[PDB]
Design an enzyme around this catalytic site. Sequence first.
Site, short mmCIF file in Angstrom:
data_model
loop_
_atom_site.label_atom_id
_atom_site.label_comp_id
_atom_site.label_asym_id
_atom_site.label_seq_id
_atom_site.Cartn_x
_atom_site.Cartn_y
_atom_site.Cartn_z
N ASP D 63 -56.06 46.37 -60.97
CA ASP D 63 -56.74 46.57 -59.70
C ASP D 63 -57.95 45.66 -59.57
OD1 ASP D 63 -58.24 47.80 -61.64
OD2 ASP D 63 -58.57 49.66 -60.53
N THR D 96 -58.55 50.28 -54.15
CA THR D 96 -59.38 49.09 -54.28
C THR D 96 -58.58 47.82 -54.00
OG1 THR D 96 -58.96 48.97 -56.66
CG2 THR D 96 -60.86 50.25 -55.93
N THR D 97 -57.27 47.86 -54.21
CA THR D 97 -56.43 46.69 -53.95
C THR D 97 -56.17 46.51 -52.46
OG1 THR D 97 -55.39 46.88 -56.13
CG2 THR D 97 -54.22 45.61 -54.44
N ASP D 402 -57.19 56.74 -61.96
CA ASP D 402 -56.90 56.63 -60.54
C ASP D 402 -55.93 57.71 -60.07
OD1 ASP D 402 -58.59 54.48 -60.40
OD2 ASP D 402 -57.00 52.96 -60.43
N1 LIG Z 1 -42.71 53.60 -55.21
C1 LIG Z 1 -43.21 52.87 -54.18
N2 LIG Z 1 -42.39 52.33 -53.24
C2 LIG Z 1 -42.88 51.61 -52.22
N3 LIG Z 1 -44.19 51.36 -52.03
C3 LIG Z 1 -45.11 51.83 -52.90
C4 LIG Z 1 -44.66 52.63 -54.04
N4 LIG Z 1 -45.77 52.98 -54.73
C5 LIG Z 1 -46.83 52.44 -54.08
N5 LIG Z 1 -46.44 51.76 -52.99
C6 LIG Z 1 -47.35 51.05 -52.05
O1 LIG Z 1 -48.25 50.21 -52.78
C7 LIG Z 1 -49.57 50.30 -52.23
C8 LIG Z 1 -50.59 50.31 -53.35
O2 LIG Z 1 -50.42 51.48 -54.15
P1 LIG Z 1 -51.31 51.75 -55.46
O3 LIG Z 1 -50.94 50.75 -56.54
O4 LIG Z 1 -51.22 53.22 -55.77
O5 LIG Z 1 -52.81 51.44 -54.98
P2 LIG Z 1 -53.62 50.14 -55.50
O6 LIG Z 1 -52.70 48.97 -55.22
O7 LIG Z 1 -54.88 50.14 -54.67
O8 LIG Z 1 -53.84 50.42 -56.97
C9 LIG Z 1 -49.62 51.57 -51.40
O9 LIG Z 1 -50.16 51.29 -50.11
C10 LIG Z 1 -48.19 52.05 -51.28
O10 LIG Z 1 -47.80 52.07 -49.90
#
Ligand SMILES: Nc1ncnc2c1ncn2[C@@H]1O[C@H](COP(=O)(O)OP(=O)(O)O)[C@@H](O)[C@H]1O
Lengths: 520, 40, 548, 546
Positions: D63, D96-97, D402
């Site tokens: 992140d 945060t991403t 997180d």
């Molecule tokens: N299993 C999944 N299938 C499709 N999209 C996903 C999945 N998991 C997360 N996402 C998408 O990826 C984005 C980032 O999720 P996440 O990694 O939890 O947050 P960050 O990137 O801030 O750490 C979210 O907006 C979500 O819509």
Amino acid sequence: NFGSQTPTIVVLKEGTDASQGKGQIISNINACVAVQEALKPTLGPLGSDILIVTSNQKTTISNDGATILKLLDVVHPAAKTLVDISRAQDAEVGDGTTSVTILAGELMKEAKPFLEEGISSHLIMKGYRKAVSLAVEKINELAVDITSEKLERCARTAMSSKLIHNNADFFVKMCVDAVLSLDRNDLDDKLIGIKKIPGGAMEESLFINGVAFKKTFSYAGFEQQPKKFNNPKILSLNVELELKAEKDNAEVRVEHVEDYQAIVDAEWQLIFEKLRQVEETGANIVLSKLPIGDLATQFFADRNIFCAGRVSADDMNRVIQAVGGSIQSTTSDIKPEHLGTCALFEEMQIGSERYNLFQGCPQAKTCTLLLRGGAEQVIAEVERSLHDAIMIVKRALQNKLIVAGGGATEMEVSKCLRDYSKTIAGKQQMIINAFAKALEVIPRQLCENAGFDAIEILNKLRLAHSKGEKWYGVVFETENIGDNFAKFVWEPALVKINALNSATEATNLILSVDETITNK
Amino acid sequence: EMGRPFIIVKDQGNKKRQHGLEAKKSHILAARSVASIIKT
Amino acid sequence: SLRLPQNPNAGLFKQGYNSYSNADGQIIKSIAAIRELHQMCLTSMGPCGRNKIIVNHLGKIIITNDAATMLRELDIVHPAVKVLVMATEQQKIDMGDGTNLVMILAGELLNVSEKLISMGLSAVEIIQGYNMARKFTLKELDEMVVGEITDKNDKNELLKMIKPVISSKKYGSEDILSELVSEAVSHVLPVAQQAGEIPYFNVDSIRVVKIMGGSLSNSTVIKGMVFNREPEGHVKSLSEDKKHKVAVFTCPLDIANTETKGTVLLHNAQEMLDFSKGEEKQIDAMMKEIADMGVECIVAGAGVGELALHYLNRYGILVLKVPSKFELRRLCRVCGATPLPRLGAPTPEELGLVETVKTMEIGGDRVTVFKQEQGEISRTSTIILRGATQNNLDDIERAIDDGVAAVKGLMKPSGGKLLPGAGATEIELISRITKYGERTPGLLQLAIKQFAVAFEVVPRTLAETAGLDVNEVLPNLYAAHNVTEPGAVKTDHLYKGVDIDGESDEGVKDIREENIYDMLATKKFAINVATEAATTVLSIDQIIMAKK
Amino acid sequence: QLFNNSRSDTLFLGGEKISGDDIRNQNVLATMAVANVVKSSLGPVGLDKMLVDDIGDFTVTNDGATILSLLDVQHPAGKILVELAQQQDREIGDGTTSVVIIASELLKRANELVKNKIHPTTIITGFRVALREAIRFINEVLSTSVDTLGKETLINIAKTSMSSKIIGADSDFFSNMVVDALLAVKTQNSKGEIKYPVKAVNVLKAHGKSATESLLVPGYALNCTVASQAMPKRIAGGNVKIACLDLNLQKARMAMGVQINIDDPEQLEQIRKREAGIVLERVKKIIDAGAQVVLTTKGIDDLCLKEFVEAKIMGVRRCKKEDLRRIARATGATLVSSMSNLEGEETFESSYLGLCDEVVQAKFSDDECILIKGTSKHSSSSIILRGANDYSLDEMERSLHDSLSVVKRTLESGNVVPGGGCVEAALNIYLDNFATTVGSREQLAIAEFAAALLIIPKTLAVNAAKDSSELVAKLRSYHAASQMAKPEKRRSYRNYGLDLIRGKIVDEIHAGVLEPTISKVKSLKSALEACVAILRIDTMITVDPE
Ligand SMILES: Nc1ncnc2c1ncn2[C@@H]1O[C@H](COP(=O)(O)OP(=O)(O)O)[C@@H](O)[C@H]1O
Ligand SMILES: Nc1ncnc2c1ncn2[C@@H]1O[C@H](COP(=O)(O)OP(=O)(O)O)[C@@H](O)[C@H]1O
Ligand SMILES: Nc1ncnc2c1ncn2[C@@H]1O[C@H](COP(=O)(O)OP(=O)(O)O)[C@@H](O)[C@H]1O
Ligand SMILES: [Mg+2]
Ligand SMILES: [Mg+2]
Ligand SMILES: [Mg+2]
């Protein structure tokens, strides 16, 4: 094994840059947009100019897309593509070099968000190559045969964005008769040549039926020669008249003193023999490339014969076309029918510089203008405007076509392209609609230099193509938007045809290159 | 910048660029310095 | 303990000498060094291949996707890479075709060899595996050939040869680039059918003139040669027709000068008075015999004096300057003239025939038109190439040369011998070598089976550069080759190939309708050079470098 | 860009002052330079990045919160997204991403809007009016936490946070650990309001075995070493008394700055013996109270170690102050800074001692930890992570951190929204018809705001090495038809998102991907304030240091 170091072999020599990754092709886009940033304010008659000083401290003021890129030395590989299309557009048509660079850089800017997506590099080029095919055929519909109405309108629009444009009530009258002196299938680029005189005012210029050259040398017998001829006869000669060794070698072997006197007298008779043959033919004016000493100049002074030398090869080529004479490399072959003439010959001094005026000939293909101005660039900018204005009326003689300007061309072509994207694909529709919006940078940026609101203009352009048809364009004077056909603003089709083909070829070249290697 | 040297024109850092109102103010004051010399 | 012995008895050689052997993973580093420049040419493969920019030390920029041209300006360090660099240059000289295939195929043979060496296969057994598999590969290429060019010149048949070759180099529009090259080929062919004469062709006959400005659609084909020249005395459109008689002089036009101590000797004033008029009568007497023969144009090979140019303008004779040699040599092949050094009256049998000589503005400068007409045909025609950028003009010139070199492949062998394109040639060899690897007992089958795996790069590269998934598209193509051959003849499944973009899912039906094919004479030397290039790298157990 | 401007003509400044469009151009490049990192790390198909301190140590962080924290950015406008990524951890804890990519895209598309001569106040108003309607639209499309009979939520809530992380493939195993850990540490305040003290779950670093074999500790696990080796290593039996003392058990000097002056030499020894005897008086009250484990914040002198071995008491020294506060509430003990009461007498009361089922000290891979399980008064939880090395567990430590913040938002507010680009794509179609109503110069600002949110769903397909257009074009087909789906459930057309593994469009409810609704509200408001502050900067003035 020969040492404990055992160095690691590098594939490329030290100093080579890197590539691939992410953003390598994006680096080439931002290089062209930054160059476009300078040429955008120079678009339109209300546009500005750019002051550029090179390492030699040579002041040059140019808004032309071709001249600006020649002053700066571009070491960026992708940014040099905008220089090639600017010099290629200036070589043939001569106008639109600024619009080509602005249009070519916009095609790369609209393709920037497509590269960040999953769109392949060749898929983007499929949209530009297909849209330019229907765009060239659309220009033919914009143009009109105009065999009716028999230079005046097209020469006024070419001077826009550049100096003396407000003086078009004067300089345009000379641009019309400039190319008309050139017969069809010839249209010589030298015979329209113009000389620059530092000092004076540009409004004092006048039209001349023939070439005018600088003396560059002061003869001791020059003033003794009359400067006003009622019926002069111009004789072009390649001979060298003076006392010197004749052909390529000089040696003399004389045993007796009595024969030594005859050698000197023989040299005077041979030089005078070439001088007598010129007088017997009645040639009032003698021109030569090779130097002419004071011996031949003083002989022509007593006979009231004008003499000149040092003239460049390009100037005497205009003399043969002006007076309809011929070049004689020897004095023994001179015949009366090979001598040209004119109505009168008068030497007038312009800016502490005296020139020979050739005018009054019944048929003359030579056109030479004498320009004045305060700054050394002023006299350069006027000819720079005249040289570009003659090429517009030059291409009009081969084909007579009118296409509405002032952003009216890009709006009508982009209209039929949005309908093509609506009927087919939908994979390519995003690219075609981006190409239609990429053509809108020309009317948008051209209206930003005038301080007008771009939102109000562009919103009124799209919905007005029903009753406005192809001739609907922007009007500067009334601040409103109205038909340019009634405004008389005209422009040939060859400007827009080469602009769309050069911008597409330059854009597809960089989009097809994902790697740039620079050695050393 | 992305981490790679960006040079459009040779002698990048040598040449300077003036634009906007500051470019117009420098041109007017350059003529005022010449005028006040000639006006005397 | 503080400092190493630093390789004792290393003073036997200079400190700049280094020793690298197959042991200690250097043979793996050499293969890994190939992959650095291998991926550079992978994105340049196919019609969707991407061109590359290479800036030399002088500042010249050459934008091309050709592997043979790109490796010229690049400075190579690793010794075994120069084996791959010089291997691609030979393919461009010899056949003028298949340059990117040698670069990719020779690089993949080393990639599959990394797994072969890790399993313990000696360098001797690996070389014998590729040599036995290549001999079987060359024999299967002659069995899979389909169709032939038959007659030398045809309007339609030249679209099945030059067009698929120039499709990879500056794809753009198809029919626009194919018509320009196919027109110039028909002019240089002697034809003369039913005469039984031996056909002849020259790859340097067709010349490409680069002229900036305009557009690609405005290009044309000129039967004569085009130079940038300014006539001295006058310009003439020569509308009086009845063609012309032209003579070519490789020697300059001027008074013959003694090669040693040329000097004017005048004893008395009597010889000085006639010296000025004497030289005028010499050129007059020599040029009068040329004008009496009806010669309206004279080609000069060096600088001509002003005294000689005077009498040439008297009779209205054009003057041409042809510097160096090769420029003047191809001028006589157009008009069918024989140069002679003397300034005397040329032989009427050695005079050429050119109907019109025109001077017009193309790219802003005066060019002279040598173009011929229907009758009195000429050879070594030129192609006017118009473009906005000079960088595109350079590779298209090499793209046309690739089509000219393809015409040479129609002369030496018995025919054209078209092969299935779109990568179908290397894919069919995979199933044939796989069956060949099983028929050979012993441990040599490991290098033979992996030799066919290296052919999988052609379908994977064309699919990857087209924006398609190589995992979905490639296995779907084997479905046509997995059904082998049925109980009935006339099997068209050999025409299946890789498609660029579009609807994907294999596609383009049978390539017979697409008309894109490959040359058999090109694939013969492309496999041999690429195999010997990878064999040379694998045959070197120890590499020694100097100064670095 | 291009050539540098002249330095203070007639302006007479000691620093550098640049004016015009060059400031806004460099401000975009500041946000675009820091975005290209965060971009490729978005989504389950994102890849980790490695940061090096040049000292030999590397840091793997997925992140952009820690990435922008470690990377030094001296650009004034570049520090905004650096502080924004550090901010997103404070409020929501996740996102945060996404907050950096959106805020960088809002400024990117606004760079072409200022070339139109549109004033930023029109650009800012266009983004704010579109945001007011966007927050209201999210509240209309939210789904209740009821769903089916069983929960079927908290298990799927954690799986969304486990994406983009190396443990994402194991998310099925870690889903039940995060849910059971937060429900044990829950508390009560504000007269019935349930609070979730994030970070109360101890995260331990162990080597060996595998991440799939990590066992959830039914209780608190203290990281520390045993005082003396002669103490019993394992304590069994019910009702284990634990003493938490913040008072120094080591012998200390008398008062602070006083001086001990002794006249009679016979009292020289007796005075010194009393200094060591007062310390053991507090230990005698602990031994008689029956305390099995004595937890001390500071160290323990050897005088107190001999009494614990003879009485079979486990002493512990060098305890963290924040660790003992969680032990007191869980075990039921009361934190004792000193022994005293309202009366003048000094005594120890047995009510200050806690109770649990068992106290055992576990040692795995040089990591010694005391496992406290079966707390009667208040339950607790701890997670022992196992991985390659310490740096491999550093990413696993922040991966589970997180996940605790995402589950907290779903229990407090049962309103959740589907992930995978559902919210970003749904706001586009809603704002397309809304911009046509206002018109004038604000129609283009709202249209660019809806297109700026498309960077999130498009980044998913770019990092997956697949075709982005076919995934986005089919994505809009469901959302564009969702606004026109019209009443009568048969509606459908909504809550659909991209599946990056299979390359298809499926329902995110059945796929098990959900995201808290409050995460979308705080992200769009925080990402806008970063763009508004940049669009309002006409001139940047940099003063050289003295
Ligand atoms: N299993 C999944 N299938 C499709 N999209 C996903 C999945 N998991 C997360 N996402 C998408 O990826 C984005 C980032 O999720 P996440 O990694 O939890 O947050 P960050 O990137 O801030 O750490 C979210 O907006 C979500 O819509
Ligand atoms: N009097 C005018 N009224 C409206 N538009 C004009 C006028 N003069 C020039 N233009 C527009 O300005 C554009 C640029 O013209 P010009 O300055 O000749 O070329 P460049 O900008 O490439 O030097 C043309 O496309 C033309 O349509
Ligand atoms: N439109 C097309 N569709 C499918 N395959 C093509 C197409 N155009 C070219 N190819 C294939 O791509 C290959 C590219 O050959 P290439 O290595 O570029 O030859 P060279 O190096 O001589 O230019 C050709 O063998 C051809 O079969
Ligand atoms: Mg112009
Ligand atoms: Mg080829
Ligand atoms: Mg997350």
